[PDB]
């Protein structure tokens, strides 16, 4: 990585802490913030027997891919389209985690400037 | 069954890497007295062995020949459906 140098060879209070994020209110800065929706219900995931690390918002694409694989047998090269859809859906979920990370980094630095401004005058 | 050992007069240190060893020993007044005994390792079917880069590339000539057609065959087939 590269951001480590900004936390190890640099100030640590200006960097996010993955063991402590989020460190700011979720609604702070988001008027009437929207909530992520789960298309797949609990029963569908329970009856689909998905690993807990897959029981996530990106589910309801894995179920469709798994359903295709059971049906395309023995054609194991098929269902490729559903794989990409689930790969893409997970990818969007990964980028949003980075957005939460960059949002955390900016807010921390925003608190830095605000505190210094009122601190210096005092 | 008796085995026919080749004639020993065909093993020579000329034109092989053993010659350049003779040149460097010559400059110091020394000579290689076993050079012809180790000469067979550089002549015959062992001469001009392939390189490391060429060795890893073995069979690539035919492989790429079959690769281009394979995708080309798919290209026409996929055009229809």
């Amino acid at each position: 990585g590269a951001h480590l140098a900004r936390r190890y060879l640099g100030d640590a209070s200006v960097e996010p802490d993955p063991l402590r994020m989020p460190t700011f209110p979720p609604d702070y800065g988001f008027p009437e913030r929207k909530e992520r929706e789960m298309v797949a219900t609990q029963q569908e995931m329970n009856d689909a027997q998905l690993v807990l690390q897959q029981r996530d918002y990106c589910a309801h694409y894995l179920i469709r891919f798994l359903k295709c694989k059971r049906d395309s047998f023995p054609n194991f090269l098929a269902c490729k389209h559903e794989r990409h859809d689930w790969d893409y859906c997970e990818h969007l979920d990964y980028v949003k985690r980075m957005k939460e990370f960059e949002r955390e980094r900016r807010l921390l630095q925003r608190k830095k400037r605000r505190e210094q401004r009122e601190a210096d005058m005092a | 069954s008796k085995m026919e050992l080749p004639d020993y007069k065909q093993w020579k240190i000329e034109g092989t890497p053993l010659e350049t060893v003779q040149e460097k020993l010559a400059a110091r007044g020394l000579r290689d007295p076993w050079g012809r005994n180790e000469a067979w390792r550089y002549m015959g079917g062992f001469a001009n062995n392939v390189s490391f880069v060429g060795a890893l590339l073995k069979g690539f000539k035919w492989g790429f020949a079959a690769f281009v057609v394979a995708i080309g065959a798919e290209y026409y087939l996929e055009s229809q459906k």
Partner: protein, 171 residues
């Protein structure tokens, strides 16, 4: 006890073998093999038993500092990955005397041709014993070397196990 010539020759053989391991490539070994020979030829005539000795001791100390950590070994030489490998197939000859008669019957020619050696061995034993006890000094032998047979029809003393020793690839 080893003479100076014996020790010098051994150091020359080891150095080439370690040098051979260092170079791997034959032509490179050939280049350095001769240079090593040259360093030895320039002290052959030295007749000074003291200055010559210093050379050997300094020669050995140089060999140790440059000896290959993992010298090449011939597979069946002590240390090579075949030493003692076939010792598990070498059966002593006397085991055949314990075979069941129904098992000797499978090789009538071998065992018929085997009684001769046993017949030969017993007959020669008395002469072999007598030869040793008359050529042995009063205080007993001073070395392990053994005399040959000094007549015709007499086998060398103490030949049975040397002659009859198991083969090298018995099975």
């Amino acid at each position: 006890y080893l003479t100076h010539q014996q020790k010098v020759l051994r150091l020359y053989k080891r150095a080439l073998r370690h040098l051979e391991s260092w170079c791997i490539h034959r032509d490179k070994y050939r280049y350095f093999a001769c240079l090593l020979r040259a360093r030895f030829d320039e002290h052959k005539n030295e007749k000074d038993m003291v200055k010559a000795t210093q050379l050997l001791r300094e020669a050995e100390e140089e060999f140790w500092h440059g000896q290959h950590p993992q010298p090449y070994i011939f597979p069946e030489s002590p240390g090579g990955t075949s030493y003692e490998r076939y010792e598990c197939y070498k059966v002593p000859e006397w085991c055949l005397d314990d075979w069941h008669p129904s098992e000797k019957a499978m090789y009538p020619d071998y065992f018929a041709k085997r009684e001769q050696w046993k017949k030969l061995r017993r007959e020669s034993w008395e002469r072999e014993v007598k030869q040793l006890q008359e050529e042995t000094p009063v205080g007993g032998p001073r070395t392990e070397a053994l005399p040959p047979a000094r007549k015709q029809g007499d086998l060398p003393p103490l030949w049975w196990h040397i002659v009859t020793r198991p083969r090298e690839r018995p099975m």
